[PDB]
Nucleic acid binder design. Structure first.
Lengths: 200, 162, 121, 102, 225
RNA sequence: GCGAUGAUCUUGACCCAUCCUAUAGGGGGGUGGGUACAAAUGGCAGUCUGACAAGU
RNA sequence: GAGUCCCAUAACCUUUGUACCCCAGAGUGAGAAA
């Protein structure tokens, strides 16, 4: 008799752990935290996943590292808020911002441990390797850009840019000599009189 | 009746096969900053560069038709465009990579029409050589000898090659 | 400068200016940023004093990077002209390394001040 | 990776084997590196072009590690232009010099 | 030149005309930091027990070290991305290492190696708010710690009870001077083991790894919820 | 139902087999060595000195 | 104070791989098959 919010890949996963609003918070490890047992307890209810786009990743990063103010989080908030039921909140710093809404938000660290250990088996139905791939993609995509400055002034590209300069000059000199030889078989004189490659 | 087309034609096209391999590898390592995952999935140079000219930024998202027309593997690349994400953007001056990949495309399409040209030229100049040994070995033979008359006046034992 | 991270205060800055004075007195220190990085490269320098006053401070703060990569102590004093007068040239000095030989007549206070630096890392 | 370099290396970052062989045999080092193809040391004439190679290496190290390890710099080249004016008036006040008498 | 397996698959001994320690490669071609590649065909990367800290712990050895080639590894660690490459080389492509560092001076080289190595997940928040990096991690099977800032046991305690599973494993390089100088090795180490078993991590082993670096032990521990 | 329109031709060292004297050696199984090309955070391979100058 | 331009964009060597061939070679010249 509860719904819990946990952000997993780009989403807000409402997991339905069918127990009491206080006893599932209370006991929570004598509730037999096993795969089949907590799988049948915490059943899948909803997963507001926006997209796999980096803009949805930015919305998820702003909802995670700062207090929850995502529009997708508000859309998931208007999906079980009709009974003032036990919506188990995840973050502790985004708890006052979670409480600033007409809902009944609530060892809960241990029920999140259980939810986390039985997420990639069945709870969205998705793959273990695909969840880890989406997570490493998220980390390489937008965690480094939201902590760090950018990568717009990245400098590793300029090495291959100047390598293209040098090899383009070398290769174009060889093409120039080959064209001057081949058309010199039709015209043996003018390579002496216009030595310029592109004018040739 | 002139092998001076054919000797520098073949000594041209082997060199440009080498440097389009070089430039396609450079397009591969450049677009690895935008698609580090596509390089293992599409390994072919010409189709690689032709689809690098197609998909500029990671915004395919909807179709498979044009991706298979550039080609299932298309669908895997489409999913990996949003699951890979080990990638920078650099979109404001990725247009030079877009011009560069089609430059490799124009070079590799000048190839095979030069190759068609010298297949015709060995069918016209040395037709017995083209029919017996093929155009590639024929042009390599008259180049490696120096000229057609020098190859002819060579004795039968000094037609050794590598 | 909030990015000048280890910056001293009165007692320890007075002690390190005294020991850099004695090191310049017997002339086994090096004066200047690129000379300090040269000593960091060739492993000679015992520690580094720098000036959290340079404009901009990123002319100086590159040598912290390879300095902690080569685990050498490194301090900031808040005045370039102060440690320039300490090192004994007439110029505002941005950084100074202090070299090492074991026959040195200031060896024990060098070791004392470098342990004092490592107490705040 | 070149921000963490002494300005001596940036004076000699192109004339590698000439430098190392002029160390190897007990001979005299070069003075330009790769930096000889810069416009200011091109404009200098004599061995004061080696002198301005030294001072341009120093100011290049300054400006280089400024815009390397900066985090919010204006993308404008302000202290680069300031150092350019500094090396420029340095160059004119050493081209005023002539060791032959008047 | 012959390759010897350890108890943990991923750490090998390349011994012969030279005798040393190697790992596998989750990235072919080149030593990413500048060591020698032993070739057998199959490539092997040296990792120096000086320039690493876990590597010298293998030179210490263990009854059960919690890094296994399926065992998902968390790495609070020092900020450098050096040893996480060989934790990746141990764990292979089926396991995964999550390396979390805050000071982005080696964050850029961490991103650089982790781009070409998909075995590493780079987390670039602090080492003290796993509530902030929840959504990038789920239920790691081991943690390693090489933090020097002095609330080592408390902050790896919070990480280990938020992300490490039940009956999992912690392995820590406890520094002496980076938390408490002027007080001796076994004293501050027994103090750290005391506060770990206060946090009900069952300790198994401490050892000082003396000739590779001075006065920093490694402690290891079973976890008990 | 051959061939000047070109017959013929000297192979860098050894592990079980097919042959000549229940187990052991010498004459088509196993194999080193080298030749024509691209890459290396491979080696040669080390990143100059450090306060005086100029003019009156 | 202080030798770049002899190419550090390098030059050579090694290692990795790759399509490779493993024969005398201003090759010898009349024999093979029974």
């Amino acid at each position: 008799y509860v719904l819990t919010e946990t952000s997993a890949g780009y989403a807000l996963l409402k997991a339905s752990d069918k127990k009491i609003y206080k006893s599932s918070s209370l006991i929570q490890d004598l509730d037999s935290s096993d795969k089949v047992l907590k799988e049948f307890k915490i059943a899948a209810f909803s997963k507001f996943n926006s997209a796999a786009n980096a803009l949805e990743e930015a919305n998820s990063i702003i909802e995670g590292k700062v207090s929850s103010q995502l529009e997708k989080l508000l859309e998931e908030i208007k999906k079980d808020k009709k009974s003032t039921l036990i919506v188990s909140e995840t973050k502790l710093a985004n708890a006052i911002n979670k409480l600033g809404l007409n809902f009944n938000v609530v060892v809960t660290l241990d029920i999140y441990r259980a939810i986390k250990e039985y997420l990639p088996e069945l709870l969205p139905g998705m793959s273990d390797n695909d969840l880890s791939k989406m997570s490493l993609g998220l980390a390489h995509s937008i965690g480094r850009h939201k902590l760090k400055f950018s990568a717009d002034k990245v400098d590793v590209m300029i090495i291959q840019a100047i390598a293209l300069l040098d090899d383009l000059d070398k290769e174009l000199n060889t093409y120039a000599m080959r064209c001057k030889e081949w058309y010199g078989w039709h015209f043996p004189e003018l390579a002496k009189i216009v030595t310029d490659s592109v004018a040739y | 009746k002139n092998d001076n087309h054919i000797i520098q034609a073949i000594a041209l096209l082997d060199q440009l096969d080498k440097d389009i391999n070089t430039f396609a590898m450079r397009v591969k390592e450049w677009y690895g900053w935008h698609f580090p995952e596509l390089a293992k999935l599409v390994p072919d140079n010409y189709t690689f560069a032709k689809l690098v000219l197609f998909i500029k930024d990671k915004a395919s998202l909807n179709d498979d038709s044009l991706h298979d027309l550039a080609a299932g593997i298309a669908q895997r690349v489409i999913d990996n465009a949003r699951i890979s994400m080990g990638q920078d953007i650099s979109e404001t001056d990725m247009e030079n990579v877009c011009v560069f990949a089609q430059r490799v495309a124009s070079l590799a399409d000048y190839r095979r029409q030069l190759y068609d040209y010298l297949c015709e030229k060995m069918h016209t100049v040395a037709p017995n050589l083209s029919e017996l040994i093929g155009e590639v070995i024929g042009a390599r033979l008259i180049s490696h000898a120096g000229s057609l008359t020098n190859l002819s006046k060579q004795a039968a034992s000094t037609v050794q090659i590598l | 400068n909030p990015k000048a991270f280890p910056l001293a205060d009165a007692a320890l800055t007075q002690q390190i200016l005294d020991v850099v004075q004695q090191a310049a007195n017997l002339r086994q220190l090096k004066k200047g940023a690129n000379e300090a990085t040269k000593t960091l490269n060739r492993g000679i320098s015992e520690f580094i004093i720098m000036a959290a006053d340079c404009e901009p401070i990123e002319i100086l703060l590159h040598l912290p990077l390879l300095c902690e990569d080569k685990n050498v102590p490194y301090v900031f004093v808040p005045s370039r002209v102060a440690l320039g007068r300490a090192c004994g040239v007439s110029r505002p000095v941005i950084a100074a390394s202090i070299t090492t030989n074991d026959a040195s007549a200031i060896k024990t206070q060098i070791y004392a001040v470098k342990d004092k630096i490592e107490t705040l890392l | 990776s070149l921000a963490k370099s002494p300005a001596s290396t940036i004076q000699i970052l192109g004339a590698e084997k000439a430098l190392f062989r002029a160390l190897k045999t007990k001979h005299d080092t070069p003075k330009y590196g790769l930096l000889y193809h810069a416009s200011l040391v091109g404009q200098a004439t004599g061995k004061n072009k080696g002198k301005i190679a030294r001072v341009l290496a120093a100011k290049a190290a300054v400006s280089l590690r400024y815009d390397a390890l900066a985090e919010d710099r204006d993308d404008s080249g302000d202290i680069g232009l300031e150092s350019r004016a500094k090396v420029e008036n340095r160059l004119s006040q050493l081209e005023g010099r002539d060791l032959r008498t008047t | 030149v012959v390759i010897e397996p350890h108890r943990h698959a991923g750490v090998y001994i390349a011994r012969g005309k030279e005798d040393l320690l190697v790992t596998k490669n989750m990235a072919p071609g080149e030593s990413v930091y500048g060591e020698k590649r032993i070739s057998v065909k199959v490539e092997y990367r040296v990792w120096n027990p000086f320039r690493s800290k876990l590597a010298a712990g293998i030179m210490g050895g263990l009854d059960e070290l919690f890094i296994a080639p399926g065992k998902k590894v968390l790495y609070l660690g020092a900020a450098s991305g050096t040893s996480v490459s060989h934790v990746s080389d141990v764990v292979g492509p089926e396991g995964v290492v999550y390396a979390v560092e805050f000071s982005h001076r080696p964050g850029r080289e961490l991103i650089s190696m982790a781009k070409k190595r998909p075995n590493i997940i780079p987390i670039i928040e602090d080492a003290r708010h796993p509530q902030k990096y929840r959504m990038l991690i789920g239920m790691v099977d081991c943690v390693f710690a090489d933090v020097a800032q002095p609330d080592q046991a408390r902050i790896i305690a919070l990480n280990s009870h938020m992300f490490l599973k039940d009956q999992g494993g912690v392995v820590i390089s406890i520094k002496a001077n980076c938390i408490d100088s002027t007080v001796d090795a076994e004293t501050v180490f027994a103090r750290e083991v005391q506060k770990l078993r206060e946090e009900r991590i069952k300790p198994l082993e401490q050892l000082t790894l003396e000739p590779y670096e001075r006065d920093h032990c490694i402690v290891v521990g079973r976890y008990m919820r």
